[PDB]
Amino acid sequence: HMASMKKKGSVVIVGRINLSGDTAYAQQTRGEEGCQETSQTGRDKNQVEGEVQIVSTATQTFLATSINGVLWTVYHGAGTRTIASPKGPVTQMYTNVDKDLVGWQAPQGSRSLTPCTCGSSDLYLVTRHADVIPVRRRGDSRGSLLSPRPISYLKGSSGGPLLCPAGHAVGIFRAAVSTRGVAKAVAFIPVESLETTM
Ligand SMILES: COc1ccc2nc(O[C@@H]3C[C@H]4C(=O)N[C@]5(C(=O)NS(=O)(=O)C6(C)CC6)C[C@H]5/C=C\CCCCC[C@H](NC(=O)O[C@@H]5C[C@@H]6C[C@@H]6C5)C(=O)N4C3)c(C(F)(F)F)nc2c1
Numbered sequence: 740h741m742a743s744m745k746k747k748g749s750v751v752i753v754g755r756i757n758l759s760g761d762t763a764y765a766q767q768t769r770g771e772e773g774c775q776e777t778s779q780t781g782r783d784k785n786q787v788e789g790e791v792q793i794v795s796t797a798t799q800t801f802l803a804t805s806i807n808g809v810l811w812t813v814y815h816g817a818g819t820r821t822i823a824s825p826k827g828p829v830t831q832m833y834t835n836v837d838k839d840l841v842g843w844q845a846p847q848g849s850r851s852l853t854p855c856t857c858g859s860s861d862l863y864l865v866t867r868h869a870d871v872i873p874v875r876r877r878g879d880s881r882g883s884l885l886s887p888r889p890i891s892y893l894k895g896s897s898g899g900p901l902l903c904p905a906g907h908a909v910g911i912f913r914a915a916v917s918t919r920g921v922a923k924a925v926a927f928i929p930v931e932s933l934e935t936t937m
């Protein structure tokens with residue numbers, strides 16, 4: 740009934756993928772208990788850094804990527820949820836279920852990737868474990884892994900970027916094409932589709 744109706748928590752940044760040096764690695768910035776509390780209050784005082792964030796709800800963990808001052812992720816991870824911030828919950832500025840896409844203003848202190856205009860098909864997928872996986876572009880929204888691997892290795896990386904050789908953002912990882920549990924290809928939201936939404 741109305742008195743007891745609950746509110747879903749915010750998405751919470753719990754880590755990041757460090758791409759600042761010669762070695763990519765995941766960093767945790769908040770543990771599960773603090774995540775639970777921050778999801779309820781929507782108030783996250785932690786300092787944010789970098790381009791790729793690891794984010795969590797009470798029930799799911801995935802990635803989010805800053806491109807042109809917007810933190811983008813997948814709707815199948817975030818739904819319509821706010822994101823926690825130093826001054827409380829922040830409402831989405833983009834929501835498009837048809838593209839499996841949502842976005843919030845990028846957090847104070849993040850760095851944004853630049854949308855790719857190279858027109859190159861040699862891509863790199865960045866996972867939540869900081870693996871950098873070469874992917875050949877195979878269409879507007881598909882790419883093949885040069886080295887297939889079990890889908891287990893990609894789980895939790897939706898919202899992560901596909902990058903060009905120069906480090907520009909080409910798209911946002913959405914879904915994996917699985918054959919007998921092996922990911923041979925991935926689907927992604929092209930950056931042009933984000934730029935249109937913008
Ligand atoms: C009401 O609005 C909605 C509601 C629900 C929706 N659920 C959608 O798909 C779901 C979620 C997504 C997923 O698993 N994402 C990844 C990830 O890591 N998620 S996650 O972070 O763990 C997370 C779940 C915590 C967030 C990158 C994957 C990593 C591993 C794969 C694991 C096996 C799953 C294989 C599947 N394969 C597939 O569907 O292939 C088809 C599409 C295309 C490639 C071909 C056929 C696939 O990838 N997924 C199924 C989509 C879609 F748009 F994503 F499809 N839209 C929605 C819009």
Ligand SMILES: [Zn+2]
Nearest residue numbers: 855857903907
């Ligand atoms: Zn580029």
